[PDB]
Symmetry: C3
Subunit: 199 residues, 3 copies
């Protein structure tokens, strides 16, 4: 068809099956809801993200860990080969489309790639910047969330993949401090870029 | 079809038949031009807004009223049941589509709803933030317009609707002061989010 | 078809065949990569821009020239009649579409037009503002790039055209100072607005 779609994640944001690594290299479980479109070669991506002190995992309490403000989330079309944030199998429409139809076209501003790890922290300092106010509860007080978002080339086992990288940038240290209970939801974050291929 | 469209409002921005309520709970007539797309479940909305001292209505001159800087505009797909800003009947294409095809999908970050009034002021403090420089004339000097925009759940008579809420945030007090004559146009403001349904 | 596409420019950003004029009225050669969609009357535009001290042309070294921070780039659907930035012939799909299918609908906030020159500097002070961090090399240190982007009406020989205008706004003076060698890439800059016509 001229238009293909992909949907993945937890509509309730109550299943915490993806992964995000913060600037102190600490890995956490998170919830997400991902909706994507490939409209004749234009990739449109909608993303919600949620963290919850009760499900994210252990928060180290050393000063550096507790004061972390940035964390990275990766949307991938390569769920087995290059999937650092653990995007789940979802639903592609129509049946003749395949998830690789949702790869972004290569970023023409960046050609040195990130070497993929399962728990490595990558911090982009280039690209588009958006600003969100999050929905927070409890003692969590990150303030505004800045969002750096771009396609990034990623190398894994001699292959190159372009993924979508989101750097979520809290104004305040708060959510990675183990003394503070609460939750945070951000979205829907919209991002468009050229797709690698036509559907 | 895979794509449906809706167009409503005043192309000239010279018919002032919609309504906006400002932070002092004062209601004003405004002009708008609304163009929307439902592209296989992706809702894309383009909006222009205009205020004119000569057509907006009486501006109370108490300090609180005169110093108001924020005002809220509502795009609705429910023109009879939940239409706080008075969006006008328009044109849906194709003929097999219906305006409810333009409801946004529920915001997954917010589930406590706004109780609809015809003249109630609602102020979102969550969601995406955009920045526009307005087109102004006369003594109107709002400066930059910040725009908080998101889908919001709205309760009316036991039913729930998701609307698009725009909070337009003047840098300076100016346009609600009855001593100042002039006009302001902002747009085109673009906003995308998932639609509730496929066309 | 319901969807038409246009692609033009240098995928490598290594062919410098377009033109940008900066705030000191100095003209430079630049590289670009332009991908556009007309989705049933919605115009979506993706743009990369690159400058390189080695290919941009002579940089005057008077204080005013060297300290220039803003420069304007024009995306046009009128490659012969109104093409101030020198957008190159490209590829329209399908074969039944024509490049004029990519004209933006008129900006409803602005009706006084710019008088086109081949080397005139136009500076918009109205419209949407985005923020990018650029990819830079060498001694180039512009810092963040603010981007004012909007459709603008342009008059040429009694005809009116709407073009897309991008004002790229460096934080620091740097890239127009002839003492500083280096390069800058910004993108992909995405911009949507209503199209003048259906494909």
């Amino acid at each position: 068809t001229p238009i293909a779609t992909f949907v993945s994640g937890s509509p309730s944001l109550n299943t915490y099956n993806a992964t995000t690594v913060n600037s102190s290299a600490n890995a956490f479980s998170c919830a997400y809801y991902l909706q994507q479109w490939n409209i004749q070669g234009l990739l449109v991506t909608s993303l919600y993200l949620k963290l919850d002190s009760a499900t994210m995992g252990n928060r180290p309490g050393d000063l550096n860990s507790a004061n972390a403000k940035w964390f990275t989330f990766w949307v991938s079309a390569y769920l087995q080969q290059c999937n650092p944030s653990g995007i789940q199998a979802g639903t592609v429409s129509p049946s003749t489309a395949t998830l690789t139809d949702f790869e972004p076209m290569a970023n023409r501003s960046v050609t040195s790639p990130w070497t993929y790890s399962a728990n490595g922290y990558y911090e982009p300092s280039i690209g588009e910047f958006q600003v969100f106010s999050p929905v927070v509860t409890g003692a969590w007080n990150p303030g505004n969330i800045g969002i750096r978002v771009l396609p990034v080339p990623v190398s894994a086992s001699g292959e190159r993949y372009t993924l979508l990288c989101y750097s979520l940038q809290c104004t305040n240290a708060s959510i990675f401090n183990p003394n503070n209970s609460g939750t945070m939801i951000v979205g829907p974050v919209l991002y468009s870029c050229p797709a690698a291929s036509l559907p």
